[PDB]
Amino acid sequence: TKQITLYTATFSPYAHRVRIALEEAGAEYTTYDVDILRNMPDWFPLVNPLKKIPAMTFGGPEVPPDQPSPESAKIAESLAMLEFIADLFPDAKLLPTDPVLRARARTFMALYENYVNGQFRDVWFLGTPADPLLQALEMLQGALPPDGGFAAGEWSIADAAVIPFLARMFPYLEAGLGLYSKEDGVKMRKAMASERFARIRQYVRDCRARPSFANTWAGDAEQVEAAKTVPMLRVGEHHHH
Amino acid sequence: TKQITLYTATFSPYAHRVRIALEEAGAEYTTYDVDILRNMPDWFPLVNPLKKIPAMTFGGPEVPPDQPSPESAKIAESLAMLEFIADLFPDAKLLPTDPVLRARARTFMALYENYVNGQFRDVWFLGTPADPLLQALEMLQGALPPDGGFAAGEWSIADAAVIPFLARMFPYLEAGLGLYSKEDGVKMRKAMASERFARIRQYVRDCRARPSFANTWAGDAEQVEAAKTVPMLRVGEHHHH
Ligand SMILES: COc1c(O)cc(O)c2c1O[C@H](c1ccccc1)CC2=O
Ligand SMILES: COc1c(O)cc(O)c2c1O[C@H](c1ccccc1)CC2=O
Ligand SMILES: N[C@@H](CCC(=O)N[C@@H](CS)C(=O)NCC(=O)O)C(=O)O
Ligand SMILES: N[C@@H](CCC(=O)N[C@@H](CS)C(=O)NCC(=O)O)C(=O)O
Ligand SMILES: [Ca+2]
């Protein structure tokens, strides 16, 4: 019964994770957009002292999101939110019930967070070399069930954790967004269209086909425009190695 | 009934996390040391293709750990293992039952992984300035309940995840092990003994006082000697400014 408010921003793949899980849960929830990178509201540290999107409040009296209550629980970190939503909505089966299959979900999230995410950040924001990103993506693809299906077989929060990033990669590459070189952009576009990455392309299509993605995605062009508002995506800057 | 084999190394805080959780669960399990950093066995990629410790096998026929079975489940990534052990031993209450308290546990793990561990890596392996690490530790300390207790109140896997690192910090600093200068070593030692960090000292005492720590710790001096075998800690080497 307790209220859920998710503080969001369209560009943010971390916020996108949580919107997907809340859709899959069938939750009733409120979203509130926050201009976190250019004009953070003075009240925002009340909902997340770390000053990062997403932020979540849970319970407390029903209040406008820009008037957060001291009584609501303040939940930070997107992966913690994903597990929280699975705990709140057990009948939605956002995780498997078998312990080994649940571990596949948790391992997939850790592989992404520990080996892939930092490579996306460094290639796009620092223009570091793309080969280590492609290697990490090939590793992650190797963890998928080979024949089809999601990270743990049935859909789970592991797929909510990963699709925001994989789904942004393709249109960001096509629009030329990111500080990497022309040469590395060509390399990544050819690699991600190559037979080497057929399995992860099917994974992206399968995740994108679900209503939880369609209803939380602004469209490729619109997401590209939101990403262009991010200060660390400095237009006209590229790094070369 | 299904066997658990943890591939371990004394120096490894990541392996230590999982030993602590297995002890708290009252599990039956085997540990098998692996010289992962200097002489990895040719069979080790069969249990973990990432070639990292810890690695875990689950189920399958009982076999010597250096002859792993293709029938066992191969589980990678320490935090996935911690969640797996909680799933396997629900009567051990390795997580809270209440969703909000469980979220405090997951959030504390994510704060450590996302903001603290990388600062430990920078300071100890690169000798970068200590101030950002102390700031990250103050943030993590601020997430603890101020009046006492563990991360989520009662002990949970969140405390298994974090104590291996905090417990190594003090004796490593006493030994001067790591690429930071004497000047920053003194600065860290003074800071961690100061009133600023009284709450995290209480936390380290409370975690270390549990049998799960005593039974999985070689002793301060012995743990320092194991850490000196780690190539990336470059015993005898320090960077300055
Ligand atoms: C501002 O957008 C973000 C963000 O808020 C947080 C991030 O870590 C990233 C990011 O854009 C880049 C990107 C590349 C490819 C796929 C998804 C995202 C790099 C990245 O890693
Ligand atoms: C070699 O041991 C390891 C390791 O296997 C993985 C690590 O991330 C670290 C580490 O030693 C350093 C260290 C500092 C303070 C406390 C625990 C550990 C830095 C660190 O971050
Ligand atoms: N690990 C966090 C990361 C959240 C994050 O970095 N959010 C960015 C927007 S995509 C932000 O809000 N602020 C950037 C900053 O100040 O660190 C999570 O998983 O929720
Ligand atoms: N995220 C992994 C980290 C595991 C890890 O990095 N282990 C180190 C020992 S502490 C290793 O075995 N190898 C480091 C390397 O591959 O060079 C976990 O949580 O289990
Ligand atoms: Ca595979």
Q: Three-state SS string across chain B, please? A: CCCEEEEECCCCHHHHHHHHHHHHHCCCCEEEECCCCCCCCCCHHHHCCCCCCCEEEECCCCCCCCCCCCCCEEEECHHHHHHHHHHHCHHHCCCCCCHHHHHHHHHHHHHHHHHHHHHHHHHHHHCCCCHHHHHHHHHHHHCCCCCCCECEEECCHHHHHHHHHHHHHHHHHHCCCCCCCHHHHHHHHHHHHCHHHHHHHHHHHHHHCCHHHHCCCCCHHHHHHHHHCCHHHCCCCCCCC
Please say whether the beta carbons of B84 and A99 come within 8 A. yes
Taking the C-alpha atoms of residue B37 and residue B39, their distance in angstroms, rounded to an integer, is: 6
Taking the C-alpha atoms of residue A43 and residue B180, their distance in angstroms, rounded to an integer, is: 38
Q: Judge whether B135 is closer than 8 Å to chain A, CB to CB.
A: no
Those residues with Cβ within 8 angstroms of residue A187's Cβ, 6 or more apart along the chain or in another chain: A130, A131, A134
Tokens of B70: 């293709």
Instruction: Tell how far the Cα of A108 is from the centroid of ligand 5, in angstroms.
Output: 12
Please say whether the beta carbons of B216 and B15 come within 8 A. no
By DSSP bridging, strand B30-33 and strand B4-8 are parallel
Q: Is A11 in the pocket of ligand 1 (CB under 6 A)?
A: yes
At position A176, the amino acid (one-letter code) is: G
Which of B56, B108, B114 to mutate: most A Cβ within 10 Å? B114
Taking the C-alpha atoms of residue B218 and residue B221, their distance in angstroms, rounded to an integer, is: 8
Nearest to B87 among A87, A102, A111 (CB): A102
Which of A14, A83, A89 to mutate: most B Cβ within 10 Å? A83
Those residues with Cβ within 8 angstroms of residue A212's Cβ, 6 or more apart along the chain or in another chain: A19, A20, A21, A23, A24, A160
| Strand partners for A154 | A152
| CA atoms A63, A69, A72, A78: torsion sign | positive
The three-state secondary structure class of A38 is: coil
Output DSSP code: residue A33. Answer: E
Task: Report the chain A residue with the minimal C-alpha distance to residue B88.
Answer: A99
Taking the C-alpha atoms of residue B221 and residue B171, their distance in angstroms, rounded to an integer, is: 8
Taking the C-alpha atoms of residue B155 and residue B206, their distance in angstroms, rounded to an integer, is: 10
Taking the C-alpha atoms of residue B62 and residue B72, their distance in angstroms, rounded to an integer, is: 9
Given an 8 Å threshold on Cβ–Cβ distance, is A77 in contact with B102? Answer: no
**Cα B192–chain centre separation:** 19
**Closest alpha carbon to A56 in A87, A86, A37, A32:** A32
Please say whether the beta carbons of A68 and A46 come within 8 A. yes
Taking the C-alpha atoms of residue B26 and residue B212, their distance in angstroms, rounded to an integer, is: 10
At position B124, the amino acid (one-letter code) is: W
Tokens of B150: 């563990």
How far the first Cα of chain B sits from its last, in Å, is 55
Taking the C-alpha atoms of residue B132 and residue B143, their distance in angstroms, rounded to an integer, is: 17
Taking the C-alpha atoms of residue B170 and residue B165, their distance in angstroms, rounded to an integer, is: 9
Tokens of B73: 């489940």
Structure determination method = X-ray
Task: Classify B129 in phi/psi space as left (phi over 0), alpha (psi -120 to 50) or beta.
Answer: beta
Please say whether the beta carbons of B57 and B73 come within 8 A. yes
Q: A158 to chain B nearest CA, in Å?
A: 12
**Could you count the other beta carbons within 10 Å of the beta carbon of residue B101?**
16
Tokens of A215: 């209803």
Please say whether the beta carbons of B161 and B78 come within 8 A. yes
By DSSP bridging, strand B73-76 and strand B30-33 are unpaired
Given an 8 Å threshold on Cβ–Cβ distance, is B100 in contact with A139? Answer: no
For the sheet containing B4-8, what is the strand order? Answer: B30-33, B4-8, B55-58, B73-76
Tokens of B171: 């004796």
Q: Which atom of ligand 1 is nearest to the CA of A124?
A: 19
By DSSP bridging, strand A73-76 and strand A55-58 are antiparallel
**Could you count the other beta carbons within 10 Å of the beta carbon of residue B92?**
14
Q: Judge whether B75 is closer than 8 Å to chain A, CB to CB.
A: yes
Tokens of A216: 């939380």
Please say whether the beta carbons of A106 and B80 come within 8 A. yes
**What kind and span of H or E run contains A186?**
helix A182-193
Output DSSP code: residue A29. Answer: -
A103 contacts on B by Cβ (under 8 Å): 73, 75, 80-81, 83-84, 87
Q: How far is CA B185 from CA A230, B162, B169, B232, in A?
A: 38, 21, 11, 18
**Closest alpha carbon to B141 in B204, B96, B210:** B204
For the sheet containing A30-33, what is the strand order? Answer: A30-33, A4-8, A55-58, A73-76
Q: How far is CA A52 from CA A48, A76, A158, B150, in A?
A: 7, 8, 21, 25
By DSSP bridging, strand A73-76 and strand A30-33 are unpaired
Taking the C-alpha atoms of residue B150 and residue B157, their distance in angstroms, rounded to an integer, is: 10
Given an 8 Å threshold on Cβ–Cβ distance, is A79 in contact with B106? Answer: yes
At position B116, the amino acid (one-letter code) is: V
Tokens of B211: 């049998």
Could you tell me how many helices (H) and strands (E) chain A has, helices first? 10, 4
For ligand 1, atom 15, the nearest C-alpha belongs to A169
Ligand 4 first shell, C-beta below 6 A: A 114; B 12, 14, 36, 51-54, 77-79
Residue A24, exposed/middle/buried by CB under 10 A (0-12, 13-18, 19+)? buried
Resolution in A: 1.7
Please say whether the beta carbons of B60 and B5 come within 8 A. no
Q: Judge whether B209 is closer than 8 Å to chain A, CB to CB.
A: no
Q: A182 to chain B nearest CA, in Å?
A: 30
Taking the C-alpha atoms of residue B54 and residue B63, their distance in angstroms, rounded to an integer, is: 18
Phi, psi of A47 (to 5 degrees): -95, -25
Given an 8 Å threshold on Cβ–Cβ distance, is B110 in contact with A50? Answer: no
Please say whether the beta carbons of B144 and B200 come within 8 A. yes
